[PDB]
Design a protein around this nucleic acid. Structure first.
Lengths: 244, 92, 92, 232, 289, 285
DNA sequence: ATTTACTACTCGTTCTGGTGTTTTTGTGTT
DNA sequence: AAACACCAGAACGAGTAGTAAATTGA
């Protein structure tokens, strides 16, 4: 045996019943006694992995192959961040033994008219109501532009947690971060799309609040926003509606 | 989504650090965690097996006349049925 | 709610007292389901009748992880990772 | 010091947030390390005496002064049951320092008109419907078991408020008249059906039966509200 | 009619009980007990409780010389005469004045008080109380200024504030015991009310002026702070109680404040069948040593 | 492109280059020479490095011992999706999904030709060929063999051959998964295999099975006994076969030959192996 | 008669550091 | 390079058995 065993799927909890995300910096992760570990000056720590959906790893951080082996084996994910933004989305297994979501996602995105229909659905979901959308081709580019038009710190932080939790639920449902209906030309299209639906209603309010209140500080408001909004379920709902 | 508590005594270190993936440590041999029935009814068959000679106990939130249930493996503390209620025993 | 206590190096005038509002499921592990004011008075009846030893309590709640807990005079600690409580284990 | 400290009033749980009863037989009871211990051949059990409302002390048992001193100080009640029926009661403290239900009880029972009022409201609240109102002046084992558990639970509830068992509107001529009266209400609905279901046995079980009965019926708050709105 | 037991064990034999002390086994049938007090070092059977319940005998659990109460039982012959005569009486704002007047006059034998109002009576009560306080103070040359009843903290206090409190508590306990033994209730009070032990405070205010304050002052005069004043107080009161003359005038005051005739009075007779220095053995008790 | 393998090392970063500390010594590699980066046991990669890899389109795949397993992965090569979308197209439309099924059933039958036969006759011909090659190698290595009877849970409850057959097929699945995900394709969007998350990989593997794995299993079964850890030595044999890299250059081609991606845009594989000491613009020592 | 503070002495469990190994538990055209 | 099984011993706390001292926390 020479070790413990790897997890299964019926000993794993869904992402609807989990914590959202953790942060880590100036540390170094490892494996020990069939477990995970963290080590800063303040002292050792440990980390449950079957009760999280995202890890974030900041500067001065190190990590070892035998930890990744373990985290991935649960359904969790890894994300390296910094002063410039997120980077190096990593992930392991997916908590879905069937591929219906990917099949239908491809059946859609192959054709172009269905792609356009779903993109219009999302364009009208981006805005406060239903009849506020516009039935045009590219005037919605200027629409989104005008809608976009010591605070970028909170902007980023929230955007990072958002991207990560999306990535997690996407791979746990069975979708693909590449088969996107907008933003295409990369491998994170479905992610960069699904995240703009909530960037507006989440990032900016508390970002401005913080930037006004000058005297880390954001990640409590971000988690409270998650717990209240119920993102982890509303997103699954949006997706089952967007693909049917 | 009940509350679950697990105790471990005299077990291999390949069960004292694995269980720290679901649960969390507050003291020695004391592991506390919140989750539902399907997960724990698997964790218990996982700990019945790879424990060895040591002992372990589980107690979860429920709805009975007192408010919880529990079970044991290889522990000398038995369990009696006091006409509906479970009460721990200590034989001679 | 559901409450779990842990005692280490305490007089015997607590391990038999606490057995009235609770049960002994293992050695140093006291289990109990009851409400908030009782809990918050026990946690003071225990803070002073302990002496040099150390204890721990953990109760059901509604947070992002699903529980809270408190510690008195332990070599462990408790740290918050941006809203969530996680244990610690300092260095020599 | 020289021992543990006594129980306060805010460290206790109400009688509604509690277990109902526990049985005992052929054992010996004592105080150990400031706890309540029960010894017997099978082993040695300890008792959470603040999450309970009554004990029943069957044959063969022995108990010591320094154990009742501790039980009483919670709100639980001791009762020495027996094959022939119930036997004498015991109670140390009342979980209330108001003395209001007793004041109104005395006020009401002093006179006789509004005593007979409740006397006939007994027939009213007892029999199924109001149209049946008449305002005109192998099974025995389980039957007595349920009746015993009910008497004890009634005693606990009564004392848990400030009331007295001695002021009996009917069954008077004793000190346990009030609880006899209150128990007459729920006897028929509960005692006999299960009594027959058991007396049809082919192989104690009454305890599981009555326990599940009370758990489903909410008997505690039932009786509490009945007494409230019967004295108000 | 009364009894006290301690450092013993009990069991039932053919309508009689069988104690078991160090020296020997006393015995007594189930007809001469009446009331029954129980003290430390006693474990009691089930067949004995059966009798003590099936005969009308009372059963109580008390500290050393009844200085504290711990549990109850049923009442002598299961009667409520005192309870009924107390409830019928207290539920009348007019009839609940004469008995109060009586109680007020038992502490003012020289003057009559069946003309004054309740509000005016507490003034003279406090007057007499402060008078006896200052009198005992000047007698024992003790620095006395006033009373302080803090039901939360005993630490700071004052030596007399500490000893008189404990003596009054022991008195409360014995009064509680006898009261519950008769059949009355401690909540149906006349002067005090709002709490479950008011009748106790009242019927004990009688004896508080002759039994605990002089004791407290003789305690505070020739003692120190390091000593356990709270332990010696209840011990002195236990000694004072061993006699059994205060268990007698209480029952005589109960039957007199409710206006019960003589033919209803009962026999209050203490008993001590086990001594270490005297011989008290006679009349039916068949020592089966 | 260039592939690479690292193990028993400790990575870190310099201005715009990598550093791989080990027992022999240290190395240096400007990141515009790497391509894929197959990490391996005994490796502690840093953060300040990763944020470079990400900024060069380089990939990374935490693997076992010579791709016998896949444990995680990051963003694919150069952040592209050509293979993905051209796979989704071909599998969605049910007219193309056969032009790439009876097309792959051809490359493993070189002599015969099948462009008319359909999805139900193929099955029955494939099955027969496999039943034939199995018995062939059986009578070659003088072994008894009737069929592929086994149970997934009770792995250690069957004959000695099935054990190693399964183990080697699994290591093959592992390497295939690794390379596939490193390119940008998807496992589940399968043609012959349906539903399961790892179908396309079974479809690929069925090409390489009958020339690499059963000639391994039958030997492994003849020259060994029941009191052994055959499940360990199969993995090690396939690890030793995967060293050179004569199966990482066939896979890229057997992929680019299905999706019909042109010749000018093809990929050129190079299974490098560091410490050859013949490189350009690579500090050393 | 019962129960608690206090002591000394076993017995058991846990902590920690040097060594020698292995990179890992294994359907998928049955 | 990183992480497990194994063994050797060293340190610290739980459990039982007798002695003296009270009847209790006001």
């Amino acid at each position: 045996k020479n070790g413990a065993k790897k997890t299964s799927l019926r000993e794993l909890p869904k992402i609807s019943d989990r914590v959202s995300f953790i942060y880590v910096e100036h540390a170094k992760i490892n494996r020990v006694d069939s477990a995970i570990t963290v080590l800063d000056s303040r002292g050792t720590v440990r980390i449950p992995a079957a009760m999280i959906g995202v890890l974030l790893l900041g500067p001065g951080t190190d990590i070892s192959h035998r930890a990744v082996e373990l985290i991935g084996d649960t359904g969790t994910s890894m994300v390296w961040v910094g002063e410039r933004g997120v980077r190096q989305y990593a992930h392991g297994r997916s908590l879905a033994h069937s591929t219906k979501f990917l099949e239908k996602q491809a059946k859609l995105v192959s054709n172009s008219r269905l792609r356009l229909a779903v993109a219009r659905k999302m364009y009208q979901m981006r805005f406060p109501d239903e009849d506020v959308s516009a039935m045009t081709m590219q005037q919605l580019r200027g629409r989104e532009g005008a809608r976009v038009r010591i605070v970028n710190q909170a902007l980023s932080a929230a955007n990072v947690a958002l991207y990560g939790l999306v990535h997690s639920i996407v791979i746990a449902l069975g979708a693909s971060p590449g088969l996107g209906f907008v933003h295409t030309g990369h491998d994170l299209s479905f992610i960069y799309d699904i995240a703009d639906l909530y960037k507006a209603e989440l990032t900016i309010p508390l970002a401005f609040e913080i930037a006004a209140n000058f005297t880390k500080i954001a990640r409590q408001k971000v988690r409270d926003s998650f717990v209240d909004g119920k993102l982890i379920v509303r997103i699954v709902q949006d997706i089952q509606y967007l693909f049917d | 989504m009940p509350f679950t508590v697990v105790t471990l005594k005299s077990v291999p270190p390949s069960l004292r650090g694995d269980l720290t993936k679901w649960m969390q440590e507050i003291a020695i041999g004391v592991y506390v965690g919140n989750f539902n029935s399907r997960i724990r009814e698997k964790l218990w068959n996982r700990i019945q097996a790879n424990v060895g000679e040591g002992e372990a106990t589980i107690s979860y939130y429920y709805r009975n006349e007192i408010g919880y249930q529990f079970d044991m493996i290889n522990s000398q503390k038995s369990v009696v049925d006091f006409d509906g209620i479970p009460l721990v025993l200590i034989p001679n």
